[PDB]
């Protein structure tokens, strides 16, 4: 079904709008993302450098989204159950950090060869 | 664990079959074109990422369904959030191929 | 600046937990620093050096998200008394594709370099 694509596309924009509204950390990163994305589109670099500059930052977005989905499950569980170790939320937090450290290292290495 | 989940996602998820095709297709096309290593890697890694995310999405959807048969605001929020991550990976793959191939 | 310090602590607590508990994570931690060392020491261009480190770091990201899902299934599987590891499977499947992707990357990158 071709309409199945427009359906799953609907479920997506719903989760993008809901991430931007409820999740605060998603908003700040989205700023640094669209900035960096634009910067990459105007930097005089090669298609490999440009893609690597854009994708590394967009990975932060993807990971944060998966982190928000996990938290929504812990919150769901937290409504029925009383105690929460919050260890699942701690692991999803680390994943986002590693994505950021990655994008930072990516941008530095790529720009210090470029500007260097 | 590994092969049990890839055969489960293939038999069940229709969008995963379309990505499995896409991954292998990407590997081929990346190998045919006269491009350098980094280009070939980016051509493949981008599509493989879409698959990696879609698997994590289906993993979450599996948990949401196992928690309760009942839809909650927070459970619906979970599914939609993961479904959005897949889109970004798809778009990221689209951007990747465009920047690389327009330059070629 | 108070929310940022709070989140980074959650990340250290998460990293320290994954290290102590998950053996596969310790192997991947070794892999990252080793990937970094190998990628840097080789007279290698920027994009390749990034891709050599990025690909291995991506593995660590998926392993962490996987272990996060595993923790949720185990909170359920403790209070639900019903175990259908459909989720734990799909998680490990993702990490595998991350690893395959990493090997391919290192292959194609290092193959072209020494070509």
Curated annotation (Swiss-Prot), chain A:
Changing residue 25 to L: 93% decrease in activity. Its EC number is 2.7.1.107. Substrate binds at residues 4, 8-13, 17-20, 25-29, 42-45, 50, 64, 93, 107-112. Its cofactor is Mg(2+). Disruption phenotype: Mutant lacking this gene accumulates substantial amounts of diglyceride in the cytoplasmic membrane. Mutant also accumulates monoglyceride and triglyceride. Monoglyceride accumulates predominantly in the outer membrane, while triglyceride builds up together with diglyceride in the cytoplasmic membrane. Changing residue 90 to E: 76% decrease in activity. It catalyses: a 1,2-diacyl-sn-glycerol + ATP = a 1,2-diacyl-sn-glycero-3-phosphate + ADP + H(+); 1,2-di-(9Z-octadecenoyl)-sn-glycerol + ATP = 1,2-di-(9Z-octadecenoyl)-sn-glycero-3-phosphate + ADP + H(+). This small kinase has long served as a model for investigating membrane protein enzymology, folding, assembly and stability. Homotrimer. This is Diacylglycerol kinase.
């Amino acid at each position: 079904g071709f309409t199945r694509i427009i359906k799953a596309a609907g479920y997506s924009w719903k989760g993008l709008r809901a991430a931007w509204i409820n999740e605060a950390a998603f908003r700040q990163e989205g700023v640094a993302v669209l900035l960096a994305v634009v910067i990459a589109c105007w930097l005089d670099v090669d298609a490999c450098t440009r893609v690597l500059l854009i994708s590394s930052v967009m990975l932060v977005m993807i990971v944060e989204l998966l982190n928000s989905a996990i938290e929504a499950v812990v919150d769901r569980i937290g409504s029925e159950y009383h105690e929460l170790s919050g260890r699942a939320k701690d692991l999803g937090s680390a994943a986002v950090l590693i994505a950021i450290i990655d994008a930072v290292i990516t941008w530095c290495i790529l720009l210090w060869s470029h500007f260097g």
